[model samples]
Target: GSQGHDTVQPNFQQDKFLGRWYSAGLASNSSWFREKKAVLYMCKTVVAPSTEGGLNLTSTFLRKNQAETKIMVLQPAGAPGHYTYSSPHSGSIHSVSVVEANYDEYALLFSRGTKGPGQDFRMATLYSRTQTLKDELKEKFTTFSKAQGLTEEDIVFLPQPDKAIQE
Candidate 1:
């Protein structure tokens, strides 16, 4: 078992990670962001300099019915690729770690709640710069996510939407 200790990418670059990313696959135990079958959601994560010597994050996800955007404070969690995201509105904190990132192509993200009764909640998402992932990458993600406690069938492959959802 991971036992709450998750390793992230070493010496990850924030600048290279900033840009639009398409959801290639996702697995969540909580099913909090469920949608109709076989739909894709696009996310844009902007990392800007913060006055506190940290980074400010604005993540926008283009959903089917509407757009979901969240602005938060991104601070290093005493590690290279581990970050703590603090939401200003709900005063909630979540831990996000880059399990693997190529920056130019794909990034595998793991996230979980850090407080409240949902502390055990976790999600694994695979993101690609393009709408599709390489066959090898897809296999890698499937194996990794399975090791992360998700079944093979739980891995939802996301296809690009027909039209972009406006902000």
Candidate 2:
């Protein structure tokens, strides 16, 4: 049910959650990436439950290895796989931001943290499922993200293999 405030039933528990995530797609923004790709990794923690029915979303991301903290303000959409979450800053909601189900036991979502528009667009992440994403799923998200607005060249790939990455 739409938790009145656009919040939805959290499909996950806070205890079992609290880790890192990567961008999968941006269904609305399909042209944000042109030459570079937008590869971003987000760390999430359950702060508290939303007054409505969603969870208090909190996360952080990095670009060029620089990090920024952002919150995921979410509202229930309908089923456990759908929801509405956003940032609390200006120009945060680019067409490339979205919340969706990435796996059967896991939910993955993203927002413009601080990349898109390269000048505008802050990114964010949110999830409540009970599983992690697989490489295939990650690739699915990459394809989806590109179709939305992110370009194959303009993305933030996570786990910067050589720089020692953390969730």
Candidate 3:
């Protein structure tokens, strides 16, 4: 049987993005949301890399008293900073997140479980290893954000890094 949404299979060989990541910056639409202001912390767990250069990922951010979390098997959307995820809950295919992953550094990448980026709507998150990011790495994250049509000015880091945890 064929996989849902003509989704690309994952590659387990790549170990770069397979570990843990923390919220670093939101490339675009940072204005619609507040930084580190979220009551729930943001974090992601990449189950494994795919054979087709995709990822099996589970994510968690926040939602008041309730735990904010979702799992999706995602693949890079054939374009820079774009990704598609097949919901583990519904088996529907859509853009789940956008990534700016690189060989040498880690930074915030915009991601959405919806079709596109917008206002009063959250289709993105800024992710990194911790609240405190190196200046050079911060620039890389912001640069990627700008390239993806997000703004660096609106991007902000969280207040505390210790509070940011891995799930």
TM-score of each: 0.69, 0.41, 0.50
Q: Candidate 1 — which pairs collide?
A: none
Deviating ranges (above 4 Å) for candidate 2: 1-29, 34-48, 63-65, 85-134, 139-167
**lDDT tens digits by residue: candidate 1, 62-163:** 655666677866777777667777565564567788777665667787777656535666667677566445555567677776765667546666655324
Which residue pairs in candidate 3 have backbone atoms (N, alpha carbon, C) closer than 3 angstroms, thus clashing? Answer: 10-50, 10-51, 11-49, 11-50, 11-51, 22-128, 24-127, 24-128, 25-126, 28-150
Model 2's TM-score against the true structure: 0.41
The deviation in Å at residue 158 for candidate 1 is 4.6
- The digit string of per-residue lDDT tens for model 2 on 48-131 reads 467857756665654446566787655655554355444546543332223444333334455443433455543323333323
Cα RMSDs, all models = 4.4, 8.6, 8.8
Regions of model 3 farther than 4 Å from truth: 1-13, 30-32, 35-37, 47-54, 62-68, 76-82, 86-104, 107-126, 144-167
Clashes found in each candidate (C-alpha, N, C closer than 3 A): 0, 34, 10
In lDDT terms, which candidate is top? Answer: 1
After TM-score superposition, the amount by which residue 61's alpha carbon in candidate 1 deviates from its true location, in angstroms, is 3.2
Q: What is the C-alpha local distance difference test score of each model?
A: 0.64, 0.44, 0.49
